[PDB]
């Protein structure tokens, strides 16, 4: 089919930085002209900023500009501002006189660069309330760290766990630009009660921090 | 003013069908071509098909066999039907004039379609109790584990909205059971654990359930 | 102005 690609997929930048996002279509777009750029923020619908390659919609800051031709297009942000950290999509129209299609690029997430920050790490045993129901959720919290990349590993009596955990990460914080991460280890009540030491290990670069509890010991 | 009001959506069993419509306000549906677009949770935008201004529908190859896009000039609507739906068709669905080479652009608000055999069910809300004794330099972490609800979404507040600073409500995960699970945490001073009450307010409008859970410190 | 016209 038709396919569009943006470079990069992820970008960390600072306020005031010049930003360039490229978009290449697998074939020339309609009239070499029908490409728009959209901006999307978490939990929000996509907002169009540029159309027909280079035209800005009313109210769109002049720091945004668009260029390119045929199969290659570029979004430029001359001086990145706080309200510009978001995901950007190029979108192209294609077809013939009896054909009409559209395709999106995969999106480019523009996040805000900041100082490295180690997480505060907390580990929660399953609540007694939950254990009554026969399942044990063990929760490891990584609070307010940077960068987003981190390897969380669970250990039960010093045995690496695999396949029995799921993980979620917040969007970058509006105030301090950090991320937080929640990882839940799910075990039967039976398995949980056949072991003592529960440990969540966070590795970021040259540092691993392991936080532990022993079942029953407050 | 000018609007595109989207309706329908909700739950679809696997193998079933969705029907979504958008009603134009302030302009005539015949005047422009409109696309249907979707976005699975945490993924990118995806084009489904296009109904030209002339009234001819074309579809992305992946969607052609299951999708029909029509318009009703009398009622000023455009409509999307997709059948034989599967789990991966779970997404927010939008109608939109994309405006790639013209000045007019407009989108519907989006509506969630969940494709699953799961039955609607409110959450069980368990405490993530803070230790009475801090082991993290005078701060305590606490929260609520919002487990085994369906479908999305839930909202979480703390102390009826009075506590926002330091709160992190995490995106839900879909469990192998087909039910969702999310946690919501806040960090606070461990010295406040004796004096301050902490209650998470969990709303699950799909099941018309609200759960308020007081999270108390862990003793011993 | 769009394709398919």
Strand pairing category for A4-7 and A55-56:
unpaired
Residue A139 to residue B145, Cβ atoms within 8 A: yes
Q: What is the fold, at CATH topology level, of the domain defined by B124-214?
A: Immunoglobulin-like (2.60.40)
**H or E element that contains A192:** helix A189-193
A41, HSE (Cβ side, Cα atoms, 13 Å): 8
> Nearest residue of C to residue B59 by CA position?
C4
CA distance A103 to chain C (A): 13
Strand pairing category for A10-13 and B67-72:
unpaired
Residue C1 to residue B58, Cβ atoms within 8 A: no
CA–CA gap between residue B185 and residue B196 (Å, rounded)? 16
Residues in chain C: 5
Q: What is the fold, at CATH topology level, of the domain defined by A4-112?
A: Immunoglobulin-like (2.60.40)
Superfamily of domain covering B3-115? Immunoglobulins (2.60.40.10)
Looking at residue B164, what DSSP letter applies? -
Whether residue B27 lies within 8 A of chain A, CB to CB, comes out as no
Looking at residue A161, what DSSP letter applies? P
CA–CA gap between residue A210 and residue B155 (Å, rounded)? 31
Residue A26's nearest CA partner among A50, A1, A7, A52 is A1
Give Dmax over CA atoms of chain C in angstroms.
9
- Chain A hits for C5, CB-CB cut-off 8 Å, are 97
B34-60 burial code (b ≥16 CB/10 A, e <16): bbbbbbeeeebbbbbbbbbbeeebbbb
Resolution (A): 2.0
**Determination technique for this entry:** X-ray
Fold: same for B3-115 and B124-214: yes
CA–CA gap between residue B60 and residue A100 (Å, rounded)? 9
Q: Is the peptide bond before A63 cis (omega within 30 degrees of 0)?
A: no
Residue C4 to residue B56, Cβ atoms within 8 A: yes
DSSP class per residue in chain B: --EEEEEE-EEE-TT--EEEEEEEESS-GGGS-EEEEEE-TTS-EEEEEEE-TTS-EEE-HHHHTTEEEEEETTTTEEEEEE-S--GGG-EEEEEEE--SSSS--EE---EEEEE-SPPPBPPEEEEEPPBSS-SSTTEEEEEEEEEEEBSS--EEEEGGGTB-TTEEEPPPEE-TTS-EEEEEEEEEEGGGTTT---EEEEEEGGGTEEEEEE-PPB--
For domain A120-214, the CATH class is: mainly beta
Residue B91's nearest CA partner among B149, B46, B60 is B46
> Nearest residue of A to residue C5 by CA position?
A97
> Nearest residue of B to residue C4 by CA position?
B52
Q: Where are the domains of chain B?
A: 3-115, 124-214
β-bridge partners, B93: B38, B111
Q: Where are the domains of chain A?
A: 4-112, 120-214
CA–CA gap between residue B157 and residue B166 (Å, rounded)? 12
Report how many helices (DSSP H) and strands (DSSP E) chain A contains, helices first: 2, 19
């Amino acid at each position: 089919d038709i396919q569009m690609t943006q470079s990069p997929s992820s970008l960390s930048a600072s306020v005031g930085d010049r930003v360039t996002i490229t978009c290449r279509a697998s074939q020339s777009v309609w009239r070499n002209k029908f490409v728009a750029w959209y901006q999307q923020k978490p939990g929000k619908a996509p907002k169009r900023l540029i159309y027909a390659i280079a035209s800005l919609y009313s109210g769109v800051p002049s720091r945004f500009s668009g260029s390119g031709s045929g199969t290659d297009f570029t979004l430029t942000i001359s001086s990145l501002q706080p309200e510009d950290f978001a995901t950007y999509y190029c979108v192209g129209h294609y077809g013939s006189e009896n054909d009409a299609y559209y395709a999106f690029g995969q999106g480019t997430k523009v996040e805000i660069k900041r100082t490295v920050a180690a997480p505060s790490v907390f580990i929660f045993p399953p609540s007694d309330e939950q254990l009554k129901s026969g399942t044990a959720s063990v929760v490891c919290l990584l609070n307010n760290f940077y960068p987003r990349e981190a390897k969380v590993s669970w250990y039960v009596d010093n045995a690496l766990q695999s396949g029995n955990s799921q993980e979620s990460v917040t969007e970058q914080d509006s105030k301090d630009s950090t991320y937080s991460l929640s990882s839940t280890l799910t075990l039967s009540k039976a398995d949980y009660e056949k072991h003592k030491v529960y440990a969540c290990e966070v590795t970021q670069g040259t540092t691993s921090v392991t936080k532990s509890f022993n079942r029953g010991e407050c | 003013e000018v609007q595109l009001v989207e309706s329908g959506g909700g739950l679809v069993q696997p193998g079933g069908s969705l029907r979504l419509s958008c009603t134009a306000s302030g302009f005539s549906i015949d005047s422009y071509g409109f696309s249907w677009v979707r976005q699975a949770p945490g993924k990118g935008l995806e084009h489904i098909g296009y109904l030209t201004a002339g009234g001819r529908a074309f579809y992305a190859s992946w969607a052609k066999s299951r999708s029909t896009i029509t318009r009703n000039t009398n009622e000023n609507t455009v409509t999307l039907k997709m059948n034989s739906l599967r789990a991966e068709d779970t997404a927010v669905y939008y109608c939109a004039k994309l405006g790639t080479g013209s000045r007019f652009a407009i989108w519907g608000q989006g509506t969630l379609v969940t494709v699953s055999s799961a039955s609607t069910k409110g959450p069980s809300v368990f405490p993530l109790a803070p230790s009475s004794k801090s082991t993290s330099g005078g701060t305590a972490a606490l929260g609520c584990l919002v487990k085994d609800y369906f479908p999305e979404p839930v909202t979480v507040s703390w102390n009826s909205g009075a506590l926002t600073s330091g709160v992190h409500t995490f995106p839900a995960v879909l469990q192998s059971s087909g039910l969702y699970s999310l946690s919501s945490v806040v960090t606070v001073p461990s010295s406040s654990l004796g004096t301050q009450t902490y209650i998470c307010n969990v709303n699950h409008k799909p099941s018309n359930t609200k759960v308020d859970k007081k999270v108390e410190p862990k003793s011993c | 102005g769009x394709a398919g016209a």
